[PDB]
Structure formats: structure tokens, C-alpha cells
Amino acid sequence: RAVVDKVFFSRLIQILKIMVPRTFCKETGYLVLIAVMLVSRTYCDVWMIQNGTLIESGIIGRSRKDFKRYLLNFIAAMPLISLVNNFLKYGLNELKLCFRVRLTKYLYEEYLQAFTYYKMGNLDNRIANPDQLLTQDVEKFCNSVVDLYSNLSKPFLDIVLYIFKLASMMAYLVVSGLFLTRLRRPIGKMTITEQKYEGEYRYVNSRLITNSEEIAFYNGNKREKQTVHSVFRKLVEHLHNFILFRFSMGFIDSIIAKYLATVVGYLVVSRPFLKSTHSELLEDYYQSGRMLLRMSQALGRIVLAGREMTRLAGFTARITELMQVLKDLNGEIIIADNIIKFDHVPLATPNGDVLIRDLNFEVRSGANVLICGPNGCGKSSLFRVLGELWPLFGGRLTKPERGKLFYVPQRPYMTLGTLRDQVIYPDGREDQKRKGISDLVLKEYLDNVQLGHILEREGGWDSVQDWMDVLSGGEKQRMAMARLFYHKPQFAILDQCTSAVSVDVEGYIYSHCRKVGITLFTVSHRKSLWKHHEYYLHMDGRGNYEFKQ
Amino acid sequence: RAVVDKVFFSRLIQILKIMVPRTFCKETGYLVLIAVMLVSRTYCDVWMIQNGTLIESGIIGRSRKDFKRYLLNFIAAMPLISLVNNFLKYGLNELKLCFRVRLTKYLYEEYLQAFTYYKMGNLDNRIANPDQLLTQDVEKFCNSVVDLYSNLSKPFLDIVLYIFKLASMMAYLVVSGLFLTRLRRPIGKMTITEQKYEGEYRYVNSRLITNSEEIAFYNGNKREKQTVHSVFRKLVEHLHNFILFRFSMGFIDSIIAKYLATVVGYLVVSRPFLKSTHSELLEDYYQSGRMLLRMSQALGRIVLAGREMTRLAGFTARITELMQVLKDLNGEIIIADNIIKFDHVPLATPNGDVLIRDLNFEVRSGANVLICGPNGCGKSSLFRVLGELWPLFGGRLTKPERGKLFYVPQRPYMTLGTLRDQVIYPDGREDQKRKGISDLVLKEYLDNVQLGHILEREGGWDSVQDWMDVLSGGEKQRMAMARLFYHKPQFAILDQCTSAVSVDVEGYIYSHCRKVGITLFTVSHRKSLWKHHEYYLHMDGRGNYEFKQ
Ligand SMILES: Nc1ncnc2c1ncn2[C@@H]1O[C@H](COP(=O)(O)OP(=O)(O)OP(=O)(O)O)[C@@H](O)[C@H]1O
Ligand SMILES: Nc1ncnc2c1ncn2[C@@H]1O[C@H](COP(=O)(O)OP(=O)(O)OP(=O)(O)O)[C@@H](O)[C@H]1O
């Protein structure tokens, strides 16, 4: 699940392809910039030592100009040195930000393209809490993928650069890579579960905040505290195992990489010190052996920084799993114009179970339909099948496209934004007038909001600082009623518009509905709205339905 | 405001005390362990450089035996000298985890103690997205606070333990910390706003996930994509200025801290080399001024690591606001026993508006009350005032208690967990039998769930893998009806029981309700449930009521 091998590299290439898509794109200039201002640094660090070993020597004898004037160059190279360092830093962080932007854009365009933000979750249980796998996991993956750059690549143009100056068979990375890896697999395995627990904790908090009024009424403070501490203590308890494992890792990661590296370096550098027969004043080692031990230290630092690789396997496994949002692919629907038909389609829940297995009926744009029954017999699930929310697993089905068809769900929804956008949820604001017909929001909508909605002076046409769906009350489902009269659909399908009002304004909405060519298809548990309806289509929990007039 | 000054230190102390309660706690020993394993680690380098200079001095000659016997000591010390480093590493992040645990526990016990998880937000708008400020902000703050240790403390004692061997007037921190800070102020406010934008982005994603079905029915994929990409681009556009400021800061921060420090060290160390009269073979500089330039490097590194201080100003200035949940302190309430009184109490919304100002009614244990009226006239807001959800605002009222009372909110709520816990939401499971009367879940609760709930075989008494409030349907509000009969309160204040079956189950619930002595206080828009009710108390949108029979 986090093993570093061929499959991991393939699963990393398949996600790197979508980022830096082309040649010399907007962000491919950072793979070159941090490939030129980074090598310039590793030529500027040997120069740091070279001036370092030639400055103190200057101030040894009674020489002032050999240090005063000599030191000046260092002060002259300080601006360039710092500029190179910070240019590398900026290139790195800008590259990670651009990587994140591209990955997020791809994931979103692939994640809201259809009824897939709904299927992930309520329909399919394969990924838990997707609101964190593409908001916090993407950021961490972008941060880590670049940090495997500049580390395992920064001490890479330091072995070759030192090799430029230079029998050295000290390729002990062969035995310190096969070892010191495959011993760090638990880090990759359990970074995934740490992320999972963090996501669950955050989701519990968010759910508590969301329905913070129902919980308040029930006085469930103690129960909610218990059920949150249950998942918090399930997190830190695991972090203790994770944190204590990194200690057991550093012990072997600091006696085979950071310290034993210098031991082998000393062992190899001093092989020809028992040709250079005499090398009278044999301080040449300071310019040919010191560099060798520095190279050995960098070679050890390579594998030492290889730690970030396995900690990235978990992130890659998590995100590459989120790229099973290709369920966009994994009976038939006929695109009719005026008649909604149901040819022996057994409606069913997402799992395997049939509520009503006949559903042999149809409607036309001349007879408002009202359907009733007990609570829990494929009533609100009929629309989910008619709409592309649930599968069909049946015969034929016809509907008037999707533009000339409106749905009001069983539960209210007020989008976040301005009041105007509440009347127009789907289209938006620019489409409201520019792309489509120009509706005078100043005046044309007050008639569309003639449902007794006095909440127009209550905030003005553009009120968002004090707006939400926790403020309207029970009239936020008749605010959805003032959405048909703007969308003017050929067919309107209403799921429990009741609970708005008994008689004061319930009749007004329906009277206006068939004062326009809006054929109605409603569910309601009432006897005071049958006057403006024609057909019956009554169904019960016995698996059979009665279609009458 | 994230300026590093007296107020910041005061605010850091006031929240440091809550994670160091007593002397030698479960984590107060980590301030000792990482204080002796850290000073025992600065004995590694000093021992490393001394030995490091020792070996090759033994290989300048051809003494194989000397080098061998004087290298084995390094092999022997490798285990201890790596164990010390890794023990510092473990004691470091274990301390941050403990800090996080204590801070989270305090914040939660202070945040779920009353109806404050509700007041924060719906009632008060002072903190936005409280679900991220105690889930992600706390973790980052704990990580940062310790990282100001081992950095500004790791090099702190590398200055006193180098002074152990030593005219050192190079105290230029006075001019390099007064400068180079107050020139980094933007980082604090800018990390604060970055955290704000990240929280808003995550909240938008969570809100999209929560009511995904409603969004799917409206076909609002395009609108939701637009409103998400609007706040994502509002974030990365700011991270661009953030990482374009760090480089603009790193430039100045790497020519006054990391390289000019070396220049000043070379300048000061050279003063005597111009009273060491002759010191023939002046190699003593390798141990009498090399340490001096190392000390200057560490002194520069102190101010360089001072960067984490200002980046920690933002987190502290953020969390200190979340510790304004002291609104728990921010008319009259009388604990009567059997009368829900209302003496000239003007019910009002959280803001400064009044809906009805008389409210001079009362009820008794033998008079069920059903109230109605238009939609949007303090109907469901009467309970929010009767219950301690909204301010009393004046007048007087008396209620029996909070234990022998019940509220069914207008919107349904099924807590996450098992099916059994759905019936017992507030009390939980342990209290279901131990702290209170023992109810036989296998048999006793079937009669308590005699409301037509056929979901006895549907998952079993303990089903959580396939449970949620997005699965029940219209029966998740009458599952709250099969939750009043278990609490058996004095009065049952239920709200919008409608959308349950009109006749099949509506009559059964109310007939059973008055069989047991639970006086019903209900709001509904119906005529089929008025038979089992006594008093009108009709409500209107003109601030008046009747209270007839
Ligand atoms: N996600 C789901 N998976 C499986 N079964 C579900 C799911 N959601 C609901 N159900 C069950 O499937 C059937 C759906 O009933 P349904 O929601 O359609 O009608 P209705 O909505 O019951 O009428 P009402 O709105 O009044 O409750 C019921 O058996 C319901 O309990
Ligand atoms: N948080 C809030 N702040 C200010 N006003 C609110 C808030 N919530 C609701 N309101 C408004 O306050 C009044 C309370 O209405 P209320 O919720 O009481 O309607 P209702 O009585 O619940 O009727 P119903 O349940 O059918 O709507 C209404 O004016 C409502 O629009």
C-alpha cells in the first residue's frame, strides 16, 4: 500500500503527467530555473570553502592587504550568493504551488463534471471523506513531491561535481539502499492511516458544526463530546506509535547514513597513506581527501533524505486512489420531449433490493400527478431514478431533456452567496442576463418572488454577510417554489413542498403553477392539495401501486 | 495584527500554562529530557570536531596502528552519539503531540460545555469556520511552538558552551534583531489570512459534500464549480504573494544572518593577528578563533531561526481569539416543575428585532397545545427562546427542567453511530442500562419502536457501516417520535411532526402520546391532528396571538 517499487513509480508518473502537461508550459520554467540556480549554488559552495581556506591563511603572517583587500571579494559575492540561494528557494515553493494548482484543477474538473460528487459517498463507499483527500492531501502531496526534489537531487550534483576534481569503489549505497529501505515501510503504511484519522476527526467537527441546532435542542453536549473524544483519542494513540517508530528508525538511520558514512570515508581516503611516495609537507590531503570525505557525507545524505520518498508513497497511494473517480462510466433512457414514460422499470436502492418492480405508467403535459403512500416506499426514490442520481436496471424511460425539467428535493437547499442567487441557483448571475434572456432583477423578479416573500427589503437584493440556510426558516422550501416561475420548466417535479403553509399561500403557488404550462408531478402527505391535481398513482409498502384518476 | 511584542508574549504565556498544568506532569518531563539530551548533544559536535581533527593528524604520518586504535573509539561512540540525537528527536515531537493533546482537551471541554457550539456562529459572528481553528490550527500551533525550541535554543547554549573556552564585543544581535525583525511583520498577518482562506476553502468543500443530493437534483454542477474555483483562486493568488515575499525576505535575511555573520567573525577574530607576540607556528588559531567563527555562525543562526517566531505570532493571535468562547458568560428564568409560564416576555431573534412582544400565555400538564400561523412568525423560534438557545431578552418564563423535557427540532437529525444510539441519542449507551434503568435492547425497545419501523432486520440492532441520516428518508423524523417514549418527559415540545404518514401513523403517535402523561406542545400546518389538541394559541405575522380553545 506504500511499498516503493515499480508500481509506485508508475502511479507517480501517471499523476506527474497531468502536471507539467506540455513542454515549456507556465510552470515548466521552474524545473529549469531550479536546475540552473541550483547548480550555480553548488559551484558557489565550493567557492565558499575555497575562499574559506584562502582567507585565514591570508591572516597568518603580518599581512593586512592579503586579508583586507582579499576579503573584499567575499563581501562582493555576498549579494550574488544570497540571490542564488533565495532564487532556488522561491523556485522550489513556486513550483510546489503550481503543482498544487494544476492537480487541484484537474481533480475538480474531473470531480464535478456529472452526478459524481453525489455517487462518491451516498452511492459508493470506496473513499471516505473526499472533502479532505482533495483539499489537504493534494497540498501535502505537492509539498512532498518537490521536497524529494532539492533532496536526493541537491546532493546529486555534488557527487559528480566533486568527481570532476577526482580507485574509489565506495559504492556502499547498494547495501545501504536495499537495507535502510524495506525497513521503513511502516512509515509509508501508517502515514495513510494518520491522514485517514485526521480526516475523520475534521469531518466529525464539521458535522457537529453543520447541524449545531438539532444537537443543541437535544442537549447532546455530553454524547457529542464522547463521540468526538473517541476519534481524537483514536488518533493521538496512533501518533504515539508512529512517533515512537520514527525514533527506532532514526537510530538505524543515523548510524548507517550520517555517522557511519564518515567512517567509510576515512577508511577509503587513507588507503594510499601507508602512491605519493613522500609528498613532503603532505597537506595535499586537505585539497584531495577533505573533498573525498565531503563527497562521502553527501552520498550518505542521499539515502538519509531518501526518507521523504517512502513518506510520499502513502500520499501517492491515497491520491491515486482518489483517481478512481473515473466511476463516471461505471436499462436505457430515451430523450423524449413531452411525455414521461415508465416501461416496466423496477426502481431500486443503490444496493440490491427492489421496492416496486412494475412501475408501468406514463404521464403527459396535461394532467398534474400527485402520488402518496406510507413513509419509506420508493416515493422520493422515484425521482432519484428518474433523474440521473441512481441507476435504472430496468426497461425504457423518457423525459423532457434536463433544461425543460425542474426538481425540488425533499429537503431544502439555499446556496451560499447573495439573495439574488437564491432565486437563481443553477444558472448563476452572468448567465441570468448575459448568456440568456435579460431578466430585470430590479423589478422582473419581485413578481417572480410574489409568494408573500417580504424578505427583499430584509438585506437588499445583494445581502451575503448575514445570509445562510439557517436563517430563512420553514419558508426556504417555498423559496424553491419561487424558482419554477423563473426556470419556467415544461415539467416540475416536487418532493414534499408541504410544511410551507396550510391554506394561506399553498393554494396560490399551485394556482399560479397551472396558470403557466408547468405540468406538476408532486408527492405530498395532505388532503388540502388534491383539488388542483388529476391522477392518482398511489403506492404502498407492499410493492404494488394503483394508477387512477 | 501579529506583531511580536509584549502583548504577543503575554498571549503566548496565557496559553502555555494550560499545557503545563503542574510540576512534573506526564509531559513536563519532556522539557527536562530534551533539556539534557540536547545539552548532551552539543557534546557530540565538540567531540566530533576534536576527534575529527584527531584522525587525519594520525594519518599525516604512516602510523597505521595509531589511526586504527584512534578510530575504533569513533565506532564505539557512534551508537551513543546517534542515540542521543534520536532521543532529542523523539523527545521533541512527543512534546508537541502532548502539547496538542492538552490544548485540544482544554478547548473542547470549554467549547462543548453548554449551548456554545451553537452560539458561536449562528448567534455570534466573530470567528469564521470554528471547525478548522481547533482541528488544524491547534496542530500547526503546537508544531510551531516546540520548533521555536531546538531552534533559538539549540544554538543558544552553543554560545555559552563555546564561551567556556573564552575581547568579544561582537554583540551585533542588537542591530540585527531590531533590524531583520520589524522587517518581517507582514508574515504574521499573511499567515493568518492564509489560514483563513484555507479554512474557507475546506468549508466550501465540506458544505458541498454535506448536501450533495440537493445540489445534484438542481443540476448545479457548473454553479458549484464556479463558487469553489472562486475561493480557490482567491487562495493561490495569495500564496503567490506569500512566496514572493519570503524570497524578497530571504534575500535580506541571508546577507545579514548567514553570510555577513561570517564576515564579522573573520573581522573580529583577526584583531589580535597584527598580545600574541610571535606564537611561532601560529596554528593555535585552529582552536583559538575557529571556535569563534563557529560561535558567530551560531549567533547568526539564532536570529535566522527567529523567523519561526513571527510565523508563530499568527497562530497565537488566531487561537487567542478562539479563546473568546468565554461568551459562555456573555429577563429571568425560573425552574418550575409543571407550568411552562410566559409573563410578558417579548420573543426576538438574536439581532435587535422583535417578532411578538406580548407572549403572556401559559400551559399546564393537562392541556395539549397546538399552535399555527403564517410561515415565518416566531413559530419554531418560540422554542429557541424557551430553550436556552436564544437570549431571553426580558419578561419572565418558568419551565419544568431540562431532564424531564424534550425538543424535536424542525429539521431531523440522526447522530453518527449505531442504530441503538439513534433511539437513545442524548443519554448514549452506557447510561442506557448502568447509570439508569436497564432497558432490554433485544426486547424492551421493540415496543418503543412500535411506530411501524420495520427496520429491525435491516442491519440488526448494531449496524454502523451502512448507517447515516441520508438513508432513512421521511421516517427519520418519526424515529425522533420513537425517541420521546424512551425519555418519557413531563412535557414533549415537538416541532413540525408533519411529513409523516397522514393517517396510518400520525394518529397512532399522538394517541400513544396522551396515553402516557406527556403533555404535547406542537406546531403544525394541518387539520388532521387538531382532534387531539385543546388550545389554539394562533400566531400571526403582525405581532399578535389569541390563545383560545
Ligand atoms: N441510500 C439508501 N440506501 C438504501 N436504502 C435507502 C436509502 N435511502 C433510503 N433508503 C430506503 O429506501 C427506500 C426509500 O424510501 P423513500 O426515501 O424513497 O420514500 P420516502 O422518501 O419514503 O417517502 P418519504 O419522503 O416520506 O419518506 C426506503 O426503504 C428507505 O428506507
Ligand atoms: N438566525 C436568524 N436571525 C434572524 N432572523 C431569523 C433567523 N432565523 C430565522 N429568522 C427570521 O426570524 C423569524 C423566525 O421565524 P421562524 O423560524 O420562527 O419561522 P417559523 O416560525 O419557524 O415558521 P416555520 O417553521 O414554518 O417557518 C423569521 O422572521 C425568520 O425569517
Numbering used by the authors:
A (entry chain B), B (entry chain A): 56 to 221, 231 to 338, 347 to 402, 431 to 649
Paper text:
In order to capture the substrate release state of ABCD3, we prepared the cryo-EM sample with ABCD3 E596Q mutant via adding 10 mM ATP/Mg2+ and 0.5 mM phytanoyl-CoA, and solved an ATP-bound ABCD3 structure at a resolution of 3.2 Å with C2 symmetry. In this structure, the two NBDs dimerize in a “head-to-tail” mode. At the interface of two NBDs, two ATP molecules are sandwiched by the Walker A motif from one NBD and the ABC signature motif from the other. In consequence, the conformational changes in NBDs are transferred to TMDs via two pairs of coupling helices, and eventually make the ATP-bound ABCD3 exhibit an outward-facing conformation. The two TMDs pack against each other at the cytosol side, while separating at the peroxisomal matrix side, forming a narrow transport cavity to peroxisome. When comparing the ATP- and phytanoyl-CoA-bound ABCD3 structures, the ATP-bound structure displays a scissor-like movement, resulting in an enlarged exit of the translocation cavity. Specifically, TM4 and TM5 are split into two short helices due to the conformational changes, and the first half (lower half in Fig. 4b) moves towards the translocation cavity by ~13.7 Å as measured by the I273 Cα atoms. Although phytanoyl-CoA was added during sample preparation for the structure analysis of ATP-bound ABCD3, we did not observe clear density for the full-length substrate, but a pair of extra densities in the translocation cavity. Based on the density shapes, they could be tentatively fitted with a pair of CoA molecules located symmetrically in a positively charged pocket, except the missing cysteamine group. Compared to the phytanoyl-CoA-bound ABCD3, the binding site of CoA is localized deeper towards the cytosol.
